[PDB]
Amino acid sequence: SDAQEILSRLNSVLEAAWKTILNLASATDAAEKAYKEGREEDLATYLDQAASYQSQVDQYAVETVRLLAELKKVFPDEEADRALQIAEKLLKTVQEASKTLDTAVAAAANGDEETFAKAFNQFVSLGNQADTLFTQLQRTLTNLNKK
Amino acid sequence: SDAQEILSRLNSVLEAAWKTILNLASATDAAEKAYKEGREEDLATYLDQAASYQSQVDQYAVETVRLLAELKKVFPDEEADRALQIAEKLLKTVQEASKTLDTAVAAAANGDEETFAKAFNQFVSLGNQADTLFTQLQRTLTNLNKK
Amino acid sequence: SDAQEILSRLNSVLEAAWKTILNLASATDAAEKAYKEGREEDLATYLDQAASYQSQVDQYAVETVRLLAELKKVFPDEEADRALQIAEKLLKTVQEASKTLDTAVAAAANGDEETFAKAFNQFVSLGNQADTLFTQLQRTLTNLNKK
Numbered sequence: 001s002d003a004q005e006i007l008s009r010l011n012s013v014l015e016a017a018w019k020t021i022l023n024l025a026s027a028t029d030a031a032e033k034a035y036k037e038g039r040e041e042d043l044a045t046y047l048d049q050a051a052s053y054q055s056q057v058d059q060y061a062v063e064t065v066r067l068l069a070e071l072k073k074v075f076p077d078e079e080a081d082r083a084l085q086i087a088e089k090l091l092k093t094v095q096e097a098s099k100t101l102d103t104a105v106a107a108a109a110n111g112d113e114e115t116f117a118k119a120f121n122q123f124v125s126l127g128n129q130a131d132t133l134f135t136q137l138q139r140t141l142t143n144l145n146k147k
Numbered sequence: 148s149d150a151q152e153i154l155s156r157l158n159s160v161l162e163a164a165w166k167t168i169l170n171l172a173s174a175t176d177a178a179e180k181a182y183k184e185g186r187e188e189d190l191a192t193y194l195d196q197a198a199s200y201q202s203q204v205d206q207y208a209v210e211t212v213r214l215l216a217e218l219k220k221v222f223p224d225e226e227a228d229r230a231l232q233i234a235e236k237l238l239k240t241v242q243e244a245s246k247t248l249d250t251a252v253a254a255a256a257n258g259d260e261e262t263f264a265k266a267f268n269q270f271v272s273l274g275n276q277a278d279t280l281f282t283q284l285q286r287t288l289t290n291l292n293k294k
Numbered sequence: 295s296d297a298q299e300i301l302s303r304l305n306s307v308l309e310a311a312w313k314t315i316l317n318l319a320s321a322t323d324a325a326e327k328a329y330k331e332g333r334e335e336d337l338a339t340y341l342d343q344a345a346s347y348q349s350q351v352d353q354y355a356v357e358t359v360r361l362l363a364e365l366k367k368v369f370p371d372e373e374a375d376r377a378l379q380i381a382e383k384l385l386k387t388v389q390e391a392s393k394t395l396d397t398a399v400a401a402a403a404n405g406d407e408e409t410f411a412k413a414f415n416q417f418v419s420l421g422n423q424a425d426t427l428f429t430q431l432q433r434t435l436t437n438l439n440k441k
């Protein structure tokens with residue numbers, strides 16, 4: 001059929017996404033420290049890195065939805081439907097995180113610390129919510145791969 | 148450092164951004180054609196290309212605001228302030244275009260054509276608005292490059 | 295060298311090539327539009343973009359020929375022999391397309407509309423020939439992959 005090839009591509013996308021997520025978390029740790037130390041040029045560099053990693057996570061989350069939508073067409077069963085539902089919620093959260101990080105990056109560039117700090121704290125909350133969904137998706141794709 | 152080094156960096160940034168904008172316009176034209184033709188995998192490819200170019204425009208728009216904020220610190224008048232205000236409005240519009248394109252990409256991945264079409268049409272309107280501001284910023288910067 | 299690793303690599307190469315072909319078609323659509331509208335600087339940019347994708351397609355065609363030759367040695371059967379023959383015809387055709395695109399670039403640079411129009415028309419014809427060959431190659435590789 002096709003399910004096994006799709007599942008293999010999904011494994012590769014999620015492994016790449018996890019590395020990118022680790023890089024995003026590291027860049028935002030560094031951004032937070034630069035903000036607290038008042039190092040504006042360092043902050044700008046780490047925010048730019050974070051934005052690049054966030055855009056890459058956005059792409060992988062879209063790819064994940066598309067692959068699971070294809071899986072459900074070729075292997076209809078509530079476990080694939082469940083994985084697709086989780087992936088769609090993850091993508092929604094990732095895009096919320098992305099828009100919020102964008103607001104923080106613009107506020108920092110505009111010299112607007114109040115909006116920066118509010119947006120940054122919102123981003124952290126959304127990133128943690130996305131991590132919960134990502135881990136849940138990973139668990140689910142073990143049913144489907146048969147550990 | 149000096150107002151001249153800054154203004155020359157800004158010219159390089161805007162030149163690069165214009166090339167990226169041309170590529171974004173071309174990718175979105177191709178997405179529209181694939182959408183009209185019902186070619187879903189082609190549409191996915193072109194939406195991903197569009198999102199990548201949009202991410203790059205976002206980065207250049209941030210860099211433009213940062214450079215004009217630095218120019219204003221170096222020679223504080225009202226011509227620098229006016230350019231910065233235009234660039235800040237451009238960045239806001241760019242980020243609105245980016246969030247709206249992201250919604251369209253997600254809707255397409257989810258097979259929700261109603262949301263896709265609404266978000267894609269909003270993206271086009273925002274893109275045209277951003278083009279107006281980009282051209283306005285370029286005019287303003289010519290009046291600053293006072294040889 | 296084993297048959298399955300080579301087929302795997304070929305599948306990846308052809309998927310990457312298809313995305314690049316989509317990008318080449320988009321850049322050439324944009325070039326045609328700029329030409330029709332008299333936007334000469336836009337045309338120049340889009341021709342440079344098209345040439346970049348054309349050079350990438352050329353390299354994927356080279357890689358495909360090399361890989362199919364390897365497949366014939368460790369996996370002799372007349373389908374791989376047919377695939378190599380198609381791939382070599384594709385490589386000849388994409389090189390001819392590259393030459394014609396080069397002529398279009400130089401004609402635009404010289405502002406020689408008569409030569410430009412002839413070269414661009416020839417490019418479109420060669421692009422359609424290459425598309426037929428690429429489709430045949432995809433079908434032959436599907437046959438080889440034996441599910």
Ligand SMILES: NC(=O)c1cccc2cn(-c3ccc([C@@H]4CCCNC4)cc3)nc12
Pocket residue numbers: 021024025026028029032054057058093094095097098124126127128130131132134
């Ligand atoms: N932002 C995302 O799209 C995203 C997707 C999936 C898992 C994610 C995990 N994060 C995440 C990103 C950053 C952080 C914080 C921010 C700074 C403090 N320590 C790390 C915590 C979680 N972001 C994720």
Ligand SMILES: NC(=O)c1cccc2cn(-c3ccc([C@@H]4CCCNC4)cc3)nc12
Pocket residue numbers: 168171172173175176179201204205240241242244245271273274275277278281
């Ligand atoms: N989207 C942006 O951030 C952006 C920034 C600056 C100038 C811009 C110009 N555009 C733009 C992008 C796409 C389009 C249309 C929409 C699709 C079909 N024809 C091209 C029109 C304008 N987007 C821009």
Ligand SMILES: NC(=O)c1cccc2cn(-c3ccc([C@@H]4CCCNC4)cc3)nc12
Pocket residue numbers: 315318319322323326348351352387388391417418420421422424425428
């Ligand atoms: N040029 C190539 O090497 C090539 C290789 C494989 C498949 C291809 C398909 N094309 C192609 C490229 C461009 C076009 C037209 C020409 C411009 C207006 N509409 C798109 C039609 C087909 N080019 C291909």
